[PDB]
Scaffold this active site. Structure first.
Site, PDB file in Angstrom:
ATOM      1  N   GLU B 692       0.884  -1.150   0.000  1.00  0.00           N
ATOM      2  CA  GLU B 692       0.000   0.000   0.000  1.00  0.00           C
ATOM      3  C   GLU B 692       0.920   1.197   0.000  1.00  0.00           C
ATOM      4  O   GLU B 692       1.234   1.718   1.061  1.00  0.00           O
ATOM      5  CB  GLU B 692      -0.903  -0.067   1.215  1.00  0.00           C
ATOM      6  CG  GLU B 692      -1.946   1.006   1.350  1.00  0.00           C
ATOM      7  CD  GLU B 692      -3.146   0.813   0.473  1.00  0.00           C
ATOM      8  OE1 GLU B 692      -3.473  -0.349   0.161  1.00  0.00           O
ATOM      9  OE2 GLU B 692      -3.772   1.829   0.104  1.00  0.00           O
ATOM     10  N   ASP B 693       1.382   1.583  -1.190  1.00  0.00           N
ATOM     11  CA  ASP B 693       2.369   2.648  -1.399  1.00  0.00           C
ATOM     12  C   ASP B 693       3.645   2.410  -0.593  1.00  0.00           C
ATOM     13  O   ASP B 693       4.021   3.195   0.274  1.00  0.00           O
ATOM     14  CB  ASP B 693       1.783   4.025  -1.076  1.00  0.00           C
ATOM     15  CG  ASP B 693       0.768   4.476  -2.091  1.00  0.00           C
ATOM     16  OD1 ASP B 693       0.900   4.106  -3.272  1.00  0.00           O
ATOM     17  OD2 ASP B 693      -0.172   5.202  -1.708  1.00  0.00           O
ATOM     18  N   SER B 694       4.296   1.289  -0.871  1.00  0.00           N
ATOM     19  CA  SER B 694       5.638   1.039  -0.378  1.00  0.00           C
ATOM     20  C   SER B 694       6.389   0.298  -1.469  1.00  0.00           C
ATOM     21  O   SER B 694       5.799  -0.126  -2.462  1.00  0.00           O
ATOM     22  CB  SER B 694       5.638   0.262   0.937  1.00  0.00           C
ATOM     23  OG  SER B 694       5.185  -1.049   0.737  1.00  0.00           O
TER      24      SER B 694
ATOM     25  N   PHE C  63       0.848   3.821   4.378  1.00  0.00           N
ATOM     26  CA  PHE C  63       2.290   3.551   4.422  1.00  0.00           C
ATOM     27  C   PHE C  63       3.211   4.477   3.625  1.00  0.00           C
ATOM     28  O   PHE C  63       4.385   4.150   3.456  1.00  0.00           O
ATOM     29  CB  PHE C  63       2.610   2.140   3.930  1.00  0.00           C
ATOM     30  CG  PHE C  63       1.987   1.042   4.725  1.00  0.00           C
ATOM     31  CD1 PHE C  63       2.418   0.758   6.002  1.00  0.00           C
ATOM     32  CD2 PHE C  63       1.034   0.232   4.160  1.00  0.00           C
ATOM     33  CE1 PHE C  63       1.854  -0.275   6.718  1.00  0.00           C
ATOM     34  CE2 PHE C  63       0.470  -0.799   4.867  1.00  0.00           C
ATOM     35  CZ  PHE C  63       0.880  -1.052   6.147  1.00  0.00           C
TER      36      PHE C  63
END
Ligand SMILES: [Mg+2]
Ligand SMILES: [Zn+2]
Ligand SMILES: [Zn+2]
Lengths: 62, 822, 96, 46, 48, 116, 42, 470
Positions: B692-694, C63
């Site tokens: 999740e957006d990493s 995140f």
RNA sequence: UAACUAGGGAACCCACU
């Protein structure tokens, strides 16, 4: 510029303000996190009144 | 004004100013290089001299008397490093990559953010739909080179249909006809000549008829001025001294841009007639209403107008203090001492306070911000930033939105996405703020041609001809508007009389022609298209490829009548080709009446939205978010970073230019001080740590130096020689001698209480051993207390380098830059 | 000195927290009651709060530089209280 | 007992004293740079 | 003043009595992990 | 005239009779500007020290005593304009008072202070 | 509990050192109380 | 009649303002711009503003034009009200004086010799000087030998001396100062100033009787207090009304068996209970001691607080500790481990007390602080006291019955019965997984030691057997 | 034969959500 060593901090009974005996602000002065009004509302919603007493009285400024 | 004191009278006058080169001192005059001013926390400020002339008459002159120090932004014409070659800059430990444009105030780099404002001297018609007024006109009238501020007059129609005026320093709603009678115009026919220019449209006369029939009681100039003076902010005593206060308000308070003089009654009358006429056109709808967010209606106060607005008040306060000193030393009968009369702190400490703090006054804040030196892109984007003066946390949207007239002058994508969306903006690339010139050559040129001034016309031939304005003030009429605009443009494509920045606008629907010469308008260069052909011929490209040989610059191409600067008002009256390869070729024709052509569309973008590859393929919130992140990327922010004692320097080991670049990165010099590394990404679902957006990174790549950065942090400390009760001094504190000494390692320190460079320190290690004395050491056996700066806790690293010097005050002063790789 | 490091029954020992301790984990702004829930501690090497993927949706935590606050309940009584009320298995189904 | 400082623009070195005004002898330049430490440094080449 | 010390969002009632700074609390960045249960948080050692 | 007005602040003394405040130079050189003909302290310093005061409270720049209510309350309306004292500490000896009463001038005290 | 003559502050409570701190450096409340007691003695 | 108008002036320059207005009045009294005002008042003690007497405010504004010292009262003027105009001119009013200016401001000076020239008088003072040592201060005695040692402006005539700005001293300053530069009325020095060179105290809640008049022998509790004629309102026994008594009629009578304190005299500070009330001799016993204390009836008050009657560990020298038994003005009375009550200065050191220290009695039982122990041997054999402090071989015992030294004494503990180097040293890990790393020891134990590694950003702990210093 | 705690505030600006 947002690195995780610059943002990590924990705290346990460190430095304490003089105006009221609450913990300091910010990680540079080893301050603790704020248990704000919305978290007070959320812990009312959980019904964790002993945890809410432990936060707002015992582990902040007894 | 030359200040005069009544005893034998004497007056002081200041006539010729002198601006030296920046110089520090106690000490001898020596040229202070700006990196030295950065390191010793000095202020890179040039002294300011003036000559005095006093007549007591017995005149004496006083050449080159020191008024005070004013700060200098770097790379000016009065900085030391103007025009120096890059070898010379690298000898001065200054990089050639630094654009300048920032002040050094107490070692801190300050940027004057350009502040928007409503355009002065310009009539606007707005609608207070909530108030009791149907349509309200205004004119924020402010005369150029006048120490007094602007003074808004309002001319507003009541909603029910009378018209009133809110004048400055008058608290009641004065009728319009009262003001026209108070200007020495007694006839209703004459006032109606100055308001409605045709007597053959009976509808507008019928609309002005109730406002005319409000004040048929007052017929005399005397009674009218008496009613002006009634209900002033300073109310009147009797008939006497209230006629003069009202005459003062009509002379010096409303409309200073049409003039402040005894013969300026009729000029002020014509301009108020114009305000009432435009209000009547708005109440008819024959002219549309005015937008508060159109950027032809705004100005940008840069460092010039801002420091001028500051220096007006501070020079006036220095004159006030000289008057107080002279009032003290004439009543003793003696002669004053003029070098003690002019005190220098009121003119230098005020500039230093307003630039160092940003509290723009003794008013608003945030004008001078600290320069952002994380990236060269962030440094450039902080020097090209506009601030809307509208305050924060407003629930409305119209000051924040991307208006249509932000095309090409200001970046559409770059804006702070927090609670200042749209308020803070970033200037586009080729946009340029007009620094403004004097209107007097234009007025001489207009009087040279057949323009008829207002003090020599009949009010019958006004409506069949075009009203011509300069800087807002209406200068006359002209009969043939074409071949006047062709002549004015023909002079601007040659730079004969009119400067390139000055803008003509022929309003064609309503017979007006307005020429702006203000300082703060925002223009951008465009090509010029005769009949359906560009004037940028092949020979210009041939002479322009061979620069440094032919000495054929951009300015030679502006002089050639090929490009010209178009501002936002004039964009409303231009037919602008996007690209020439589409829009001068015959097709099923769109308009075939192009006047200008855009140079390249990629020049509508800012400095941070120019480093985005393919930004038209993205979605626009993504472009805004990258414009935020591009200011935060680590990279080599400056070339002389090893000299600079910046706090929080983030530099990178192996920065790379992008493989996928734009053409515009060549001009921001992003390929010379880049920020980031080309990386072989793959777009894959995997173990589930890029969820999740990493992102999943390569440990072996990182072990080969991939984005391994280095974070510098400096630490300054000086000691303070005081009145012997507390006295800081750098020394290694001893447990048996010093008191209150915290439990840390003090053997890392050297003999002078400092760390030698190349020494590992960690959290709560000392870096500066400093002890302050205790006044009750005699008042036993326990002496001077520890006042030491520790290393910042939960950080660690090697001490990079330590400099030891003197401050502004002459006290010893140390900076320690501590290095930690990341 | 080692003479007063003895322990008899009744002393307290403020020990560093281990695996299996209970903590409260929240995200400002705490909108609802599943924005502040009780987790069990696992000690992992690097310096972030590794938390699971399906707890992103009640926290609204994506995140990209989000940082979370972690409170520790100090008494044993409030530890049992968080375990019996505010565990994330006991906060799967929302009342709203 | 004296500390050796490097004289900024001059790049020469000179002694310094406690309670000594910070001045070079060559041209009186005010910025001194403290020499690199004499104790050992060791870097893991990681 | 005293009324200004009490009346604000930063005052005594809301700023200190309702929401106050607490000991025993940590704040760091979260990064994902799918290899631990939904009621487990993986805290650092230097926090623990 | 200006000759009555004191020249400086040092050694200001108020008269015991009419509370005229002048410097010691002006009492030495001019005597009393109201009633020196009844007192004769011009040409004698000891007569000034006997007939003027070293303790006074309050000054009044009496400019027009013919139309002053302050001159009605301080009983100085029939005098000349000048600098007067509100409260005067001191008293003439009995020889001067008896000599003034023999010339028909009874000595009214200018000590108008409220003593406790 | 509440009497209308008690609304007129005829004696002003000055709060202790726990309320206004000292850090050499005085509190703003101590400055205003200094104004109170100076004008009171005047 | 004209009225008085306030005009704000420069502070301390109000008399000069009236002088300048009088000169301005006489300078323009024949011209075409006359001052139409009537008088100017600048009082002796009203500081900051003066008064203009006029029928109009406009006359005041046109008269004060050109005067800079009144420029803060130029725009607006305020009239003194009609009933308040007499309050303007209303004036109210071998010894000791107090000096007005200088560093000796308001210090007690004994008037030695009154010089009959009425200019100055000779004054005996106590010098507030630092003897030319700090300046390149409280009252202390004139030390002639110190000012002969330090030098400077000093001239000696045996005990007579001249110093530091023509200051005249002998044996004690004897310097001339002006009569207008001192206040010769209202000093009233105290008894400590006599060593350097009636009264009414009724309190609310105290019990008083009536000694004379028609309302005699009516005992009542005090409500209020005033200065001389109090008009007290005493709550008598069996009377719901409040009567009226002055101070000369009342007397502090107290029933036998009550809380009493002493206000002044030899017996002040001490509390207790009275026993038998005579005509004026009132005898009491203290809360501390059972000694007879006989007081006047006026020197008693009714206060229900507990008596005060402290006991710290201070270091007489780094070989022998002490215990304070009496707090005094400039000294401490200190009881050491030897049992010798000494009198030492305030500037002994505070030793860290060991509240967990262990000792052994004569019967090998473990004893600590706050333990009630019997003394079976030594000089104090037979007493029983509480342990308050501990030594290697000495123990201090408190006893509320023993009136000596606040209850404190000392006995040896064996006569009782119960009733690092490596810190900051550059080390090199010479064994293990971190072998070859150079670091600095932060913390160290008998077993392990924490090493700040020079290379990584991390401080790790290793055994001392693995470290090798440089 | 180990001497053991920490000290301010107010404003603005920026960033994160
Ligand atoms: Mg996020
Ligand atoms: Zn040199
Ligand atoms: Zn007289």
């Amino acid at each position: 510029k947002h690195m995780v060593d610059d943002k990590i901090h924990s705290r346990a009974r460190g430095p304490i303000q003089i105006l009221n005996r609450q913990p300091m602000e910010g990680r540079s002065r080893d301050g603790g996190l704020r248990f704000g009004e919305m978290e007070r509302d959320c812990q009312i919603a959980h019904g964790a009144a002993q945890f809410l007493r432990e936060r707002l009285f015992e582990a902040s400024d007894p | 004004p030359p200040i005069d004191l009544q005893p034998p009278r004497y007056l002081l006058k200041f006539e010729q100013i002198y601006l030296s080169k920046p110089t520090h001192w106690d000490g001898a005059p020596s040229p202070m290089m700006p990196n030295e001013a950065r390191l010793r926390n000095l202020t890179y400020s040039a002294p300011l001299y003036v000559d005095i002339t006093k007549t007591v008459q017995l005149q004496t002159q006083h050449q080159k008397t020191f008024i005070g120090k004013i700060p200098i932004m770097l790379r000016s014409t009065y900085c030391l490093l103007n025009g120096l070659t890059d070898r010379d800059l690298c000898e001065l430990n200054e990089c050639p990559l630094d654009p300048g444009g920032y002040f050094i105030i107490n070692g801190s780099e300050k940027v004057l953010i350009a502040q928007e404002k409503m355009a002065t001297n310009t009539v606007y018609v707005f609608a207070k739909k909530d108030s009791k007024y149907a349509y309200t006109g205004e004119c924020r009238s402010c005369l150029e080179n006048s120490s007094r501020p602007t003074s808004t007059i309002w001319v507003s129609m009541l909603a029910r249909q009378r018209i009133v005026a809110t004048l400055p320093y008058i608290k009641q709603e004065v009728p319009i006809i009262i003001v026209f009678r108070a200007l020495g115009f007694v006839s209703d026919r004459d006032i109606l000549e100055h308001i409605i220019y045709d007597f053959e449209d009976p509808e507008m006369m019928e609309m002005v008829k109730p406002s005319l029939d409000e004040a048929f009681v007052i017929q005399e100039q005397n009674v009218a001025l008496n009613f002006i003076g009634s209900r002033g902010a300073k109310p009147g005593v009797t008939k006497e001294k209230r006629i003069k206060y009202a005459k003062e308000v009509l002379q010096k308070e409303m409309l200073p841009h049409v003039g402040v003089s005894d013969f300026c009654e009729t000029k002020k009358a014509y301009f108020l007639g114009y305000m009432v006429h435009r209000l009547l056109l708005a109440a008819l709808g024959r002219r549309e209403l005015d937008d508060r967010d159109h950027y032809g209606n705004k100005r940008l106060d840069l460092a010039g107008p801002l420091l001028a607005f500051l220096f007006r008040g501070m020079f006036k306060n220095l004159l006030k203090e000289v008057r107080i000193y002279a009032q003290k030393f004439i009543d003793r009968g003696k002669d004053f001492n003029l070098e003690l009369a002019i005190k220098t702190r009121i003119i230098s400490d005020g500039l230093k306070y307003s630039l160092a703090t940003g509290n723009w006054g003794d008013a608003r804040a945030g004008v001078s911000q600290v320069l952002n030196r994380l990236t060269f892109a962030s440094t450039l984007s902080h020097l090209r930033r506009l601030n809307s003066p509208i305050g924060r946390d407003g629930k409305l949207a119209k000051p924040r939105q991307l208006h249509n007239t932000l095309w090409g002058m200001v970046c559409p994508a770059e804006t702070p996405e927090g609670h200042a969306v749209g308020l803070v903006k970033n200037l586009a690339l080729m946009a340029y703020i007009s620094v403004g010139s004097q209107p007097s050559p234009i007025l001489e040129f207009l009087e040279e041609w057949s323009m008829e001034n207002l003090e020599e016309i009949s009010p019958a031939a006004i409506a069949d001809a075009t009203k011509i304005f300069v800087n807002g003030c209406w200068v006359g009429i002209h009969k043939d508007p074409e071949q006047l605009m062709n002549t004015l443009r023909k002079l601007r494509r040659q730079m004969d009389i009119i400067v390139s920045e000055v803008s003509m606008i022929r309003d064609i629907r309503e017979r007006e022609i307005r020429i702006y010469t203000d300082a703060g308008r925002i223009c951008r260069p465009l090509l010029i298209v005769e009949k359906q052909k560009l004037l940028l011929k092949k020979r210009h490209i041939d002479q322009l490829k061979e620069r440094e040989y032919n000495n054929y610059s951009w300015q030679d191409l502006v002089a050639s009548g090929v490009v010209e600067y178009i501002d936002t008002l004039e964009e409303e009256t231009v037919m602008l080709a996007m690209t020439p390869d589409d829009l001068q070729e015959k097709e099923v024709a769109y308009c075939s009446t192009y006047t200008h052509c855009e140079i390249h569309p990629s020049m509508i973008l800012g400095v941070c939205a120019s480093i985005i590859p393919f930004p038209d393929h993205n979605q626009s919130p993504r472009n805004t978010y990258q414009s935020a992140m591009g200011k935060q990327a680590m990279g080599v922010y400056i070339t002389n970073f090893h000299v600079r004692m910046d706090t929080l320097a983030h530099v990178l080991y192996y920065p790379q230019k992008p493989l996928v670049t734009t053409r515009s990165m060549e001009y921001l010099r992003f390929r010379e001080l880049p920020a980031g590394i080309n990386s072989i990404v793959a777009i894959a679902s995997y173990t589930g740590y890029n969820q999740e957006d990493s992102v999943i990174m390569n440990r072996s790549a990182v072990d080969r130096g991939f984005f391994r950065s280095v974070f510098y942090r400096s630490y300054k400390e000086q000691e303070s020689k005081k009145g012997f009760d507390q006295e800081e001094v750098f020394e290694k504190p001893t447990r048996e001698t010093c008191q209150g000494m915290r439990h840390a390692i003090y053997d890392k320190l050297d003999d002078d209480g400092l760390i030698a460079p190349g020494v590992r320190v960690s959290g709560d290690d000392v870096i500066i051993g400093k002890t302050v004395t205790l006044p009750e050491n005699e008042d036993r056996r326990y002496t001077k207390r520890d006042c030491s700066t520790f290393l910042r806790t939960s950080e660690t690293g090697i001490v990079d380098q330590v400099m030891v010097t003197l401050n502004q005050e002459g006290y010893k002063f140390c900076k320690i830059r501590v290095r930690s790789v990341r | 000195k080692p003479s007063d490091l003895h322990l008899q029954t009744g002393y307290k020992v403020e020990r560093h927290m281990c695996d299996g301790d209970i903590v409260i984990f929240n995200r400002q702004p705490t909108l609802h009651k599943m924005s502040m829930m009780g987790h069990r501690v696992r000690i992992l090497p690097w310096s972030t709060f590794r938390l699971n993927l399906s707890v992103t949706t009640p926290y609204n935590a994506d995140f990209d530089g989000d940082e979370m606050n972690l409170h520790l309940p100090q008494s044993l009584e409030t530890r049992a209280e968080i375990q019996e009320l505010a565990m994330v298995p006991r906060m799967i189904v929302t009342p709203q | 007992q004296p500390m050796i400082y490097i004289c900024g623009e001059c790049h020469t070195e000179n002694e310094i004293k406690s309670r000594d005004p910070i001045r070079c002898r060559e041209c009186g330049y005010r910025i001194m740079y403290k020499k690199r430490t004499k104790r050992l440094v060791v870097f893991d080449a990681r | 003043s005293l009324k200004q010390r009490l009346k604000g969002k930063e005052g005594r009632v809301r700023g200190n009595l309702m929401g106050k700074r607490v000991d025993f609390s940590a704040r760091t960045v979260i990064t994902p992990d799918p290899n631990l249960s939904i009621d487990q948080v993986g805290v650092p050692r230097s926090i623990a | 005239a200006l000759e009555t007005v004191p020249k400086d602040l040092r050694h200001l003394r108020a008269c015991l009779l009419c509370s005229l405040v002048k410097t010691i130079d002006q009492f030495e050189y001019d005597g009393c500007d109201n009633c020196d003909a009844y007192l004769q302290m011009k040409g004698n310093r000891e007569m000034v020290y006997d007939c003027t005061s070293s303790s006074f409270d309050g000054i009044i720049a009496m400019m027009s005593p013919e139309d002053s209510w302050v001159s009605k309350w301080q009983r100085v309306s029939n005098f000349k304009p000048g600098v007067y004292a509100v409260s005067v500490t001191g008293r003439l000896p009995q020889g001067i008072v008896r000599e003034l009463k023999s010339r028909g001038v009874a000595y009214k005290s200018r000590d108008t202070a409220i003593k406790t | 509990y509440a009497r209308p003559e008690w609304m007129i502050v005829t004696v002003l409570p000055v709060p202790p050192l726990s309320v206004r701190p000292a850090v050499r450096n005085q509190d703003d409340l101590t400055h205003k109380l200094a104004d109170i007691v100076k004008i009171n003695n005047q | 009649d004209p009225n008085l108008w306030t005009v704000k002036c420069k502070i301390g320059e109000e008399r000069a303002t009236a002088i300048s207005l009088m000169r301005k009045f006489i300078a323009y009294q024949f011209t075409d711009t006359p001052l139409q005002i009537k008088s100017v008042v600048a009082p002796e003690h009203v500081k900051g503003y003066i008064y203009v007497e006029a029928y109009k405010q406009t006359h005041v504004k046109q008269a004060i034009e050109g005067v800079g010292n009144l420029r803060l009262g130029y725009w607006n003027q305020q009239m003194v009200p009609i009933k308040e105009m007499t309050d303007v001119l209303k004036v109210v009013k071998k010894s000791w004086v107090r000096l007005k200016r200088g560093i000796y401001k308001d210090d007690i000076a004994q008037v030695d010799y009154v010089e009959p020239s009425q200019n100055t008088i000779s004054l005996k003072m106590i010098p507030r000087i630092d003897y030319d040592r700090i300046k390149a201060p409280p009252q202390r005695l004139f030390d002639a030998e110190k000012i002969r040692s330090l030098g400077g402006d000093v001239a000696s005539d045996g005990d007579f001396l001249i110093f530091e700005g023509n200051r005249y001293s002998r044996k004690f300053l004897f310097k001339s100062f002006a009569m207008s530069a001192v206040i010769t009325e209202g000093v009233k020095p105290t008894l400590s100033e006599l060593e350097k060179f009636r009264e009414h105290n009724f309190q609310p809640g105290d019990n008083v009787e009536v000694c004379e008049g028609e309302l005699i022998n009516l005992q009542g509790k005090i409500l209020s207090v005033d200065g001389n004629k109090i008009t007290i309102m005493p709550k008598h026994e069996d009377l719901k009304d409040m009567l009226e008594f002055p101070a000369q009629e009342l007397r502090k009578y107290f029933k036998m068996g009550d809380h009493v304190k002493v206000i002044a005299g030899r017996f002040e500070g001490d509390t207790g209970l009275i026993v038998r009330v005579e005509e004026n001799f009132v005898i009491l016993f203290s809360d501390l001691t059972m000694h007879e204390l006989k007081v006047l009836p006026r020197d008693l008050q009714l206060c229900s607080e507990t008596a005060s009657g402290w006991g710290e560990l201070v270091q007489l020298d780094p070989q022998t500790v002490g215990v304070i038994v009496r707090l005094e003005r400039e000294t401490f009375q200190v009881l050491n481990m030897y049992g010798k009550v000494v009198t030492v200065r305030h500037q002994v050191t505070r030793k860290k007390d060991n509240r967990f220290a262990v000792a052994l009695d004569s019967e090998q039982n473990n004893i600590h602080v706050k333990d009630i122990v019997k003394v079976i041997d030594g000089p104090h054999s037979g007493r029983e006291g509480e342990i308050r402090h501990l030594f290697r071989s000495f123990a201090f015992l408190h006893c509320k019955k023993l009136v000596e030294n606040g209850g404190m004494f000392v006995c040896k503990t064996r006569h009782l019965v119960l009733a690092n180097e490596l810190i900051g040293q550059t080390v090199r890990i010479s064994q293990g997984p971190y072998k070859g790393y150079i670091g600095v020891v932060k913390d160290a134990t008998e077993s392990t030691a924490r090493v700040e590694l020079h290379s990584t950003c991390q401080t790790i702990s290793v055994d001392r057997q693995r470290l090798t210093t440089v």
